[PDB]
Amino acid sequence: TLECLSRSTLLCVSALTVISYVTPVFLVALLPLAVVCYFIQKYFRVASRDLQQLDDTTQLPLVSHFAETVEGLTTIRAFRYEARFQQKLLEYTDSNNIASLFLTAANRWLEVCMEYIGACVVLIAAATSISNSLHRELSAGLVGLGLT
Amino acid sequence: MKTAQAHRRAETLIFSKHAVITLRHGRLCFMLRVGDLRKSMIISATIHMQVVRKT
Amino acid sequence: ARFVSKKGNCNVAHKNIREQGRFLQDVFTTLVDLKWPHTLLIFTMSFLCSWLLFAMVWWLIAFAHGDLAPGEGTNVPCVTSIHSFSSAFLFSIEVQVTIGFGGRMVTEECPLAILILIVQNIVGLMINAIMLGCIFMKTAQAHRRAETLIFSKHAVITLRHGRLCFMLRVGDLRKSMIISATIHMQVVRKTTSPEGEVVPLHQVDIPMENGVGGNSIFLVAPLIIYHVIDSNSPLYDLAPSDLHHHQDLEIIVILEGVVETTGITTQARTSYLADEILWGQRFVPIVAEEDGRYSVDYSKFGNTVKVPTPLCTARQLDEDR
Amino acid sequence: ARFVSKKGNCNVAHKNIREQGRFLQDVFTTLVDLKWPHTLLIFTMSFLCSWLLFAMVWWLIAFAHGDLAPGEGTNVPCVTSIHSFSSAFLFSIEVQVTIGFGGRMVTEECPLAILILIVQNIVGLMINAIMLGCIFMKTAQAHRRAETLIFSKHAVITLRHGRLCFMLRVGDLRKSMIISATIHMQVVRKTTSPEGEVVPLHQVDIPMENGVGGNSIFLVAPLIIYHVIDSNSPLYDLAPSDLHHHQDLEIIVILEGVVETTGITTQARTSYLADEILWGQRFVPIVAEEDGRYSVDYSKFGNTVKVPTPLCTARQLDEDRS
Amino acid sequence: SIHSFSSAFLFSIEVQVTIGFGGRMVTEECPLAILILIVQNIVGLMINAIMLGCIF
Amino acid sequence: LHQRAKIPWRACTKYLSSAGILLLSLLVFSQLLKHMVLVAIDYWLAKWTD
Amino acid sequence: MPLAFCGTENHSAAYRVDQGVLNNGCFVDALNVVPHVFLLFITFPILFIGWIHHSTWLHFPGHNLRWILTFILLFVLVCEIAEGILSDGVTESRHLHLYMPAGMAFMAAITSVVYYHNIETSNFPKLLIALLIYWTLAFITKTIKFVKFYDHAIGFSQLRFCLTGLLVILYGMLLLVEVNVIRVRRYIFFKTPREVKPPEDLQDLGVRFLQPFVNLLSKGTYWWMNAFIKTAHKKPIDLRAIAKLPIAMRALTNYQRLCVAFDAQARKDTQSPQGARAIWRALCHAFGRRLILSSTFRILADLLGFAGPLCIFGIVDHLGKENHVFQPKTQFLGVYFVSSQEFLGNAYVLAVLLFLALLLQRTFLQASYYVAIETGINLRGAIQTKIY
């Protein structure tokens, strides 16, 4: 995680540095996005850890219940309480699955929001770069570097 | 404002010309008759009867 | 035959009524209570007729003065720049609506034009006043939204606190509250007097068996309105045999009360016939507690559960106690 | 959860409601009962859009008739002196608002021009009529949207004249008093009847212990709504043990009435929980008789102080008399 | 036909009251003039509504 | 608010203190050095392709 | 010099009416403006007025055929705006009629979906008449323009003809959608409106994962998660906040689906010991209807993601040409028409197409992810129940 975080964050700042160097106007356009991005980042983190922690907690009972049902199968069936235990599992399985489903929904919400933000950067970088090359005669290779 | 008073201009509550006194359920009772002409109902109608005399 | 319809239409027939006044002032009320498409049609017709009628008379005045005849003359026309009836119609529109372009303008030539300009303006001003007056009255009708109260299709006779009682249900579908609510229960019967009197449709007041001994209620959730059938009620001589459709009985429930938002009194009359009175049934509980807010299941508003109740007479039942 | 909030904002989930149809009159009513800044925006947009929509079609007619074409004195335009869309916007403003400058004016033999002029005037009259009606009803009704009635946050159960009494304080924050104030107090409890009946929110009406037994109350200086808990009163078995927060014992006090100035009936409900009811406490006296008038210290309005009082149950209190 | 503040005073009288004599009129090629005409018309109408509402 | 604390200073100090003085700065400089070259090779490619 | 709708050619002689008004290319363009201007003015106060929730969650018929039609209709309108701006590059005159009609058509289309969405939530179908009297109003005039382009023999070579011929079909397709709503709900000039109620799954206040019950755009955007994410930042997430999952995803409902698949797989195949092949067939038959949907979204997502590299190739290729000479090279009826072979050659047009393709690609890729995850999570619930 430490290695991936460092590489991911270094790749990110490298990209913004190149786009700002390619088109200085992007620096101005970086002010709004870097504002909203923080909000997306800040809110998601609070919504992630809780969800992640909640997911882990919800895995403990379900799997434990499975172990009990094999260590005490004779007593479970003798009491004629199989139907209640089946209902207990279904509640446990539903609780774990919805914890996992919401985590995926939170992951997807962040991914789509960051994808739109990155798509907006592409439009901003492209528009400024073509304008620079048509009038101020920016290098063609620099335009390619900005878009890539 | 005249439009508001146009609806309330007329009142059409009908009372019997003369009253009666005839026993009902054994008990002696004075009686009058009341009625309404317009189809529209009169909500929360209240009847107050008074004996006016020099005492 | 019914005294009042289930919705509250109160199907009764009036006949042998003396000659009504049928004055002029009532026809305006007819214009007030017109529907939205009809009011628009009535007012568009009124404005168009006014514009057209005056358009004809301006054209006639121009014709009478000999102004629309081709050929320029020194005689100044009564109204300038009038050369057709279409121009006359436009001038009438300009004066009455008070647009007043000024391409066609009144002149000091003839006093007939001056007199008729006064008439057009006053008629135009009074028509706008009538139109605005009708708009105010009709706008209140939109805010009215009167009939939105619900009653069970059938009433019950059940056992509350051990004692038999007639019971019905009342519900307020509206989000807004109904301040100063009032329940009035009445029995519509054909009763005979020991002196020979036979009243056709006798209405007897029925107490609501409230805690304060009053008719006031408070409807936020669907409530059970019940009257304890005791010796002080005309239902004390009830019997299971009094359940046929053509049985001589009827119960009227009236919910008076001023709506909080509108600030006007509304009425909701409902009727329960003998066949709509169900013995040995109880109203299912509706309000279910929830973590967020109390929940009300309106699907089961009229649903009932059968319960064994004494299939006897209240006179014999109460005495046997 | 509570079915009536402290601020009088009752909130009960009316779940599973039969879908009553919606009508355009509801939207029209919503326009009437909107706020003041919103009404200005709606009508400004309505006026501006009406002028703009008709200016567009005025431009069409001039274009379709060749009026917008370059100069030619032979033809007579449907609207005189109409050149561009700017003139078309100005012509629509003059016609709808009835300014009618006359530099741009309608002409004859163009029946479409006459027809649209009639349509624009009819539309303008109906739009103006709505604006007057909305403004007229706004001043009448929106003035009565203020609730200046304050209850006490916490009620008390005290010992007055030997009999236990449940008391709360209500005052008026508006100089004009409420005419014909009626007070309704109801105990809400899931009272299961002994015969077998179960009701979740049964409401029991409570008397007022007034000077005549009625529900009339005069509101000039705040008073204490004291009800003597007797055998008839359901609070005959009230105890501090059942005073905890998780007990189903809630009081609703409703002071209906009509304000003299406007004439619209006003209602202000309040809910008191068992935890919000302070047993054995006395309300602080408020009205001080100054030399000329009476002083009301509203700071100490809903402040309750302890007092040595019996702490038994009103049902058990009947033994003391016996 | 705008030549002084007196003429400007008369033009505002004509528009707000909605008289529109036509000697002084709004032309094109001056979008600022058009915008204030809309603003003044809206202000004049809202004032009339307040006056009519207050009279009621 | 107390639960939603990343505790960055505490965790970073634990890793920094355990790693020491040499192997901590070396990783920071080495990772940064690797990525500055990656930007450079693309940038040099742009100049050469130009 | 002044901004002219038709233009300033030959002393503004493009406004002539002779030889029929409908034969004037400017006027048929102007007629197209009108339905858009009508809807903007008609519904703007309506959206400003309206400005539990289960009672206002019913979805109108064709809830998906409307959003996808709007998006493709939005796309062709963006292309129309881009094409029009290309068309006036040659002449000095502004020629505002090339793009402004189309430009505010896109604006009016946005308001139509906003207005429809408000009607979709607030179950007031009686208001879904403005759109009807607009769609045909937006269709009739457009057909006139199309026929006129056919009257002058524009042909498919011109890009405007292709876009107009495509855009009229889109208006026609959703016009059928609007009358389809009328046919099912039967609220206009009908006798008995058919009763449609919100799904029973959301009626309980115990459903908070409202992913099945939401508009298509928010289905692909996960806009319903904003309320939960904002709520999370203040109140820590407990099981009370995450109310139980809808009936479509419940473990019991999934097991019923898994059980019914096994009965089908073991009935016809008598010699089925419920081995690997039988279980695999059961899994495929039970959850194939969703796995294919994930694959279809994923395959489309992969294809669109490739348009980005092609867009870069087109952009930089056009930029490398130092000539920077652009012209449509033809004027069909006094208005220059650009061809498709040059429309996708412009750098700005290609950049806009790249941005639009990126938006679509990322939505499809993320949509495929969630569909696969939901199927995978649902299978886990069903598999666990069967094992237990």
Ligand SMILES: Nc1ncnc2c1ncn2[C@@H]1O[C@H](COP(=O)(O)OP(=O)(O)OP(=O)(O)O)[C@@H](O)[C@H]1O
């Ligand atoms: N059918 C009716 N239409 C209108 N008003 C009626 C009618 N019947 C009675 N009234 C009103 O009730 C009063 C008493 O009615 P009654 O049957 O005594 O008539 P009456 O003796 O002919 O009345 P009168 O000589 O006063 O007109 C009438 O005077 C009248 O005001």
Ligand SMILES: Nc1ncnc2c1ncn2[C@@H]1O[C@H](COP(=O)(O)OP(=O)(O)OP(=O)(O)O)[C@@H](O)[C@H]1O
């Ligand atoms: N859930 C509900 N929402 C609104 N009104 C209701 C509801 N349930 C019943 N009503 C009203 O109560 C009356 C009938 O009550 P009941 O519970 O018997 O319904 P029903 O059998 O479905 O009636 P119907 O067929 O007349 O609509 C009607 O006036 C109906 O409008």
Ligand SMILES: Nc1ncnc2c1ncn2[C@@H]1O[C@H](COP(=O)(O)OP(=O)(O)OP(=O)(O)O)[C@@H](O)[C@H]1O
């Ligand atoms: N001087 C006052 N002016 C206005 N409202 C008052 C005043 N005193 C009390 N109230 C109202 O009475 C209610 C509670 O009365 P109380 O005197 O106990 O106030 P409190 O304990 O300060 O209440 P809170 O916590 O709501 O501020 C509240 O609705 C409060 O707004």
